Each structure stands twice: as structure tokens, then as C-alpha cells.
Amino acid sequence: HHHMRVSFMVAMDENRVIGKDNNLPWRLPSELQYVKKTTMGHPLIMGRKNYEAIGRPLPGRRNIIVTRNEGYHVEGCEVAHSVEEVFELCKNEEEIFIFGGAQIYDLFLPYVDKLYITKIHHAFEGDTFFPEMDMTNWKEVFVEKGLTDEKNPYTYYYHVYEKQQ
Ligand SMILES: NC(=O)c1ccc[n+]([C@@H]2O[C@H](COP(=O)([O-])OP(=O)(O)OC[C@H]3O[C@@H](n4cnc5c(N)ncnc54)[C@H](OP(=O)(O)O)[C@@H]3O)[C@@H](O)[C@H]2O)c1
Numbered sequence: 001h002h003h004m005r006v007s008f009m010v011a012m013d014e015n016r017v018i019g020k021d022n023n024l025p026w027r028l029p030s031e032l033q034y035v036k037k038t039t040m041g042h043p044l045i046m047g048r049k050n051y052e053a054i055g056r057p058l059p060g061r062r063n064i065i066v067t068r069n070e071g072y073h074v075e076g077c078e079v080a081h082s083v084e085e086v087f088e089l090c091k092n093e094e095e096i097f098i099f100g101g102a103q104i105y106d107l108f109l110p111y112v113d114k115l116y117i118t119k120i121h122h123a124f125e126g127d128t129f130f131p132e133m134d135m136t137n138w139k140e141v142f143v144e145k146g147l148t149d150e151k152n153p154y155t156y157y158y159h160v161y162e163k164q165q
């Protein structure tokens with residue numbers, strides 16, 4: 001029914017941790033740059049909590065916030081209240097990025113076509129997790145080692161998986 005590619009954009013640790021106390025458990029500037037490079041010029045779909053932690057519209061992209069609050073408004077941002085409303089708003093887009101957090105990854109899980117997942121080789125303390133996925137009929141189409149240096153102190157890899165459909 002929907003015609004845009006639904007891509008997930010996520011960074012997770014060895015136990016699928018993505019969050020701690022409503023923030024990111026790590027700091028990787030190089031991984032963020034990969035995120036900016038990959039998502040530039042495409043809509044970002046983000047959970048209300050995710051968006052408010054970010055705190056500002058991200059430039060050069062449609063910012064779409066997902067909330068059950070029908071009175072919710074943010075300057076420079078679009079607001080959706082369901083999967084279908086997101087699909088309506090993005091009906092003419094070629095590709096959209098589900099940008100988190102966990103509730104929003106769970107929401108859009110039945111529809112994901114492409115997975116950009118950074119895997120961080122460390123076990124952090126956390127409270128928020130990326131959902132489990134059955135990767136049957138998916139293929140890894142890209143993999144590369146992230147930059148580990150003084151400013152990026154963990155080992156991590158970029159992975160991209162595409163659904164076979
Ligand atoms: N490592 C990563 O790649 C990454 C990426 C993104 C986020 N995170 C982290 O993950 C954590 C946030 O994730 P989270 O799961 O707590 O929050 P979230 O998914 O970003 O946002 C949750 C909110 O989304 C809205 N929502 C949920 N289900 C909905 C539905 N069915 N229909 C309409 N709206 C719905 C609700 O907003 P309302 O309450 O306003 O109704 C809900 O409170 C933070 O720690 C963040 O830093 C990590």
C-alpha cells in the first residue's frame with residue numbers, strides 16, 4: 001500500500017542497547033557524521049521522546065515527530081500520530097528513515113525494507129533496546145569498520161541489510 005522505502009537508522013551495542021536515561025550511552029562523533037551523510041535530504045521519523053532529547057529540527061530534512069498527543073506542535077517540524085499518517089505525509093518520498101527510539105522502531109517494524117545498523121562492540125549499561133529481528137530473507141549489502149581513535153573510543157561497524165522481496 002505504501003511506496004516509499006522504509007529504512008531503519010540505528011546504532012546499538014552487543015546487547016541491543018540504544019539508550020540510557022533518555023539519552024545515548026556513548027559518544028561517537030564519526031558515527032554521527034555517517035548518520036548525517038546517509039540521511040541528508042530524506043525525511044527523519046522520530047518518536048516524541050527521541051525528538052525532545054535532540055531538542056531542535058535537524059537541517060535539510062523533513063522532521064516528523066510521532067506522538068499520540070493531538071495538540072502537539074513544534075516549529076519547523078511535522079507531526080504524525082500513527083504509521084498511516086506518516087505514510088500519508090511521505091506518500092511521494094522515495095525513502096524515509098525511522099530514526100528511533102525503541103517504541104517507534106517497534107511501531108514501524110512490520111514495514112521495514114532496509115536496515116542501516118551500526119553495531120558497537122561494547123556492552124553498555126542501558127534501559128532502552130532495539131527490538132529483536134528475524135533476518136530470514138535479508139541480505140547484508142554493506143559492511144565497513146568505523147573509525148576508532150581518541151575521539152571515538154569504541155570498536156564499531158556499519159552494516160546495511162536489505163529485505164529480499
Ligand atoms: N542509539 C540509537 O540509534 C538511538 C536512536 C533513537 C533513540 N535512542 C534512544 O532511545 C531512547 C528513546 O526511546 P523511547 O522508546 O523511550 O522513545 P521514542 O520511541 O523515541 O518515543 C516514544 C514516544 O513516541 C510516541 N509513540 C509511541 N507509540 C506511539 C503510537 N503507537 N502512536 C503514536 N505515537 C506513539 C509517544 O509519544 P507521546 O508520549 O507524546 O504520546 C511515546 O511517548 C532515548 O534514550 C534515545 O536517546 C537511541
Ligand SMILES: CCc1nc(N)nc(N)c1C#CCc1cc(OC)cc(-c2ccccc2)c1
Binds near residue numbers: 116
Ligand atoms: C548518533 C547515534 C545514532 N546512530 C545511528 N546509526 N542511528 C541513530 N538513529 C542514531 C541516533 C540517535 C538519537 C539522537 C540523540 C541526540 O541527542 C540525544 C542527538 C541526535 C542527533 C544530533 C545531531 C544530528 C543528528 C542526530 C540523535
